[PDB]
Design a protein around this nucleic acid. Structure first.
Ligand SMILES: [Mg+2]
Ligand SMILES: [Mg+2]
Ligand SMILES: [Mg+2]
Ligand SMILES: [Mg+2]
Ligand SMILES: [Mg+2]
Ligand SMILES: [Mg+2]
Lengths: 120, 111, 92, 96, 61, 60, 79
RNA sequence: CAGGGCCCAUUCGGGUCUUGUAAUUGGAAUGAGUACAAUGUAAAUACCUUAACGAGGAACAAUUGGAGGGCAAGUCUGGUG
């Protein structure tokens, strides 16, 4: 029983994807352990089944980005409570590092034609 | 802080560690003079600029310009470390002149 | 760490009273000063308190300086069931 | 136009470490054998076998173009469909 | 000015011009004015005005 | 010389790229109006300046 | 919209999953080109964005082993 | 919502006189298109003219190549290694 969408073009295809996401998602609001195992794992593999070697590899790659981003957000959350730098704070013995703002100065390293006349 | 709240706690820390009697040790704050003519201040200002996210030459030209404007005879800052590559490299940023040897360096160079 | 309830209340009540605690990084010293409990207890319990944003530390030649925060005065107060604004560090 | 004979893995010149993914093609009007470089990323997966490809020069007026030793032509269309349209998934191939 | 020219509300003589690069000849400068067969030169409003008047006369009756 | 090779690796990175979907934007105007907004961003509203005008500043 | 299905149990979800596998898959047969574009991949991202970190690795690993056997399959087919 | 001297000689107050952004709202305007009619034409089609319809943000949605240098345009963010 799926007669709702017989769309034949990408732009038309877009409406289906949105609606299915609207359909599928809210099922996670209830029964989350039931959601993740019974349905998410096996529908993904079944919809991955059609696609070719390259396409599945993109899907794995897309998922990994999801993993990385999620861990990043969680890492914001844990180190929200802890007042200073890394977990365990001053007990830790390990400090929080920073990033060098190079600008564009040192890539494929050379001498700098554009010297700065004045400093703010 | 409010009514010395941080410096109150800093007094409390030094009494417990150094086993002083409560009241025998007191802490005062003091404005530093001549801030460009202070190597420990200028290095620490430089250190925060790179951690806050300033561009590295901007800071290093910025701090050497500030010290020479503050009336120093010569200023000199060195940054050594890996910039963009595994092979590390030292930058030198100078202005004015400085002496290197003898008893005069002890009295006039702050490092 | 598994330490009896009475000395964790010693560590927590002493911290409230002084606003600060200093602790030499000597495990097996087995006797803290200013407190009649093991030195390992006061280090480890304050390690548990710093890892929940209630106290901040500084090492500074093996001494572990602890000063508790604004989170620290509210949490501990809930913990000791003492009257409001009964923290010495907070009020001059 | 020509007919693809085989697929080659010509390695680039120094200093450049790559495999350049060309094809051998027999020209339809001459019967002459010719090496043609299949341009983009992944586009050798369209140019499989016995195909009608259309070929052009590279622009160097008969000279071998880059680090690629000894090819003088590039592939433009395969089986009547252009390679960038296949690469940008605007169109897709016939079966054969 | 571009859209007024292009949408035919402009007449350099008594003749509509809808070309923006027209290069007027300096005795035609006195005669650039709105087209007679247009709104802004009058005698019938236009599509969206007549629609809105149709809706307000519909609501009156 | 080495006319053989590893043809199995073709399309490696193009398959490994994570699919990031395009955000949907408001339409840009076309024609005389687009030149109008380019003129406005370049000449009257020169809000972003570093003493030298740049068109696509990275976040400084 | 989605009027047919509710959350009771793992068993009934397998019904819903199977129904969904019936529904979605013929869109690959009519336009395979759109199938590798917006429809299939971005849905898989969308259904995995509300999940648990370990589960998405379990999602990845199944795909990983799935592709692996196919790589064998085509190799056999060619040889 | 981001700006100048000045009316003020009423300290960080309206800001006239403008310049541009707005998950703020309003009417006007018109063809692309469709179509009576007439004109057009050997007869038509189309152009020119013209009733009736035809707009406004998921609508009537401009591409093609590029952003180290030559040579306009990144002090970006992920991926590969
Ligand atoms: Mg050295
Ligand atoms: Mg060379
Ligand atoms: Mg483009
Ligand atoms: Mg490119
Ligand atoms: Mg790019
Ligand atoms: Mg340039």
């Amino acid at each position: 029983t799926h007669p709702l969408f017989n769309a034949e073009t990408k732009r038309e295809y877009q409406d289906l994807r949105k609606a299915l996401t609207a359909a599928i998602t809210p099922m996670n609001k209830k029964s989350p352990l039931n959601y993740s195992s019974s349905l998410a794992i096996d529908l993904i593999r079944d919809v991955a089944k059609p696609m070719s070697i390259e396409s599945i590899r993109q899907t794995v790659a897309t998922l990994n980005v999801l993993i990385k981003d999620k861990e990043r957000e969680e890492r914001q959350a844990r180190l929200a409570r802890v007042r200073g730098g890394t977990a365990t704070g001053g007990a830790g013995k390990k400090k929080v590092k920073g990033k060098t703002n190079l600008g564009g100065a040192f890539k494929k390293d050379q001498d700098f034609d554009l010297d700065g006349p004045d400093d703010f | 802080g409010e009514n010395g709240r941080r410096i109150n706690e800093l007094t409390l820390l030094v009494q417990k560690r150094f086993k002083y009697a409560p009241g025998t040790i007191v802490l005062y704050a003091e404005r530093v003079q001549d801030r460009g003519l202070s190597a420990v201040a200028q290095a620490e200002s430089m250190k925060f600029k790179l951690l806050n996210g300033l561009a590295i030459r901007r800071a290093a030209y910025g701090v050497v310009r500030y010290v020479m404007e503050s009336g120093a005879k010569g200023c000199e800052v060195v940054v050594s470390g890996k910039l963009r590559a595994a092979r590390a490299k030292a930058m030198k940023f100078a202005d004015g002149f400085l002496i290197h040897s003898g008893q005069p360096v002890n009295d006039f160079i702050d490092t | 760490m598994l330490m009896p309830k009475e000395d964790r209340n010693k560590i927590h009540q002493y911290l409230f009273q002084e606003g600060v605690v200093v602790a030499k990084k000597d495990f097996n010293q087995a006797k803290h000063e200013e407190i009649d409990t093991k030195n390992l207890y006061v280090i480890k319990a304050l390690q548990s308190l710093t890892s929940k944003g209630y106290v901040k530390t500084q090492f500074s030649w093996q001494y572990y300086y602890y000063t508790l925060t604004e989170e620290g005065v509210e949490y501990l107060r809930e913990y000791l069931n003492l009257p409001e604004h009964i923290v010495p560090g907070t009020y001059i | 136009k020509g007919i693809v004979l085989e697929k080659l893995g010509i390695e680039s010149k120094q200093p450049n470490s790559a495999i350049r993914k060309c094809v051998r093609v027999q020209l339809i009007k001459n019967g002459k054998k010719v090496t043609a470089f299949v341009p983009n990323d992944g586009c050798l997966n369209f140019v499989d076998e016995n195909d009608e490809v259309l070929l052009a020069g590279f622009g160097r007026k008969g000279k071998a173009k880059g680090d690629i030793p000894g090819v003088r032509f590039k592939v433009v269309k395969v089986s009547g469909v252009s390679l960038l349209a296949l690469w940008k998934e605007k169109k897709e191939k016939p079966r054969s | 000015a571009r859209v007024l020219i292009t949408q035919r509300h402009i007449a350099v003589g008594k003749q509509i011009v809808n070309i923006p690069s027209f290069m007027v000849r300096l005795d035609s400068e006195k005669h650039i004015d709105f087209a007679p067969t247009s709104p802004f030169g009058g005698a019938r409003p236009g599509r969206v005005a007549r629609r809105n008047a149709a809706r307000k006369a519909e609501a009156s009756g | 010389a080495k006319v053989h090779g590893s043809l199995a690796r073709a399309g490696k990175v193009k398959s490994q790229t994570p699919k990031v979907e395009k955000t949907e934007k408001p339409k840009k105007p076309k024609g005389r109006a687009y030149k109008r907004l380019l003129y406005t961003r370049r000449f009257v509203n020169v809000t972003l300046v570093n003493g030298k005008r740049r068109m696509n500043p990275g976040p400084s």
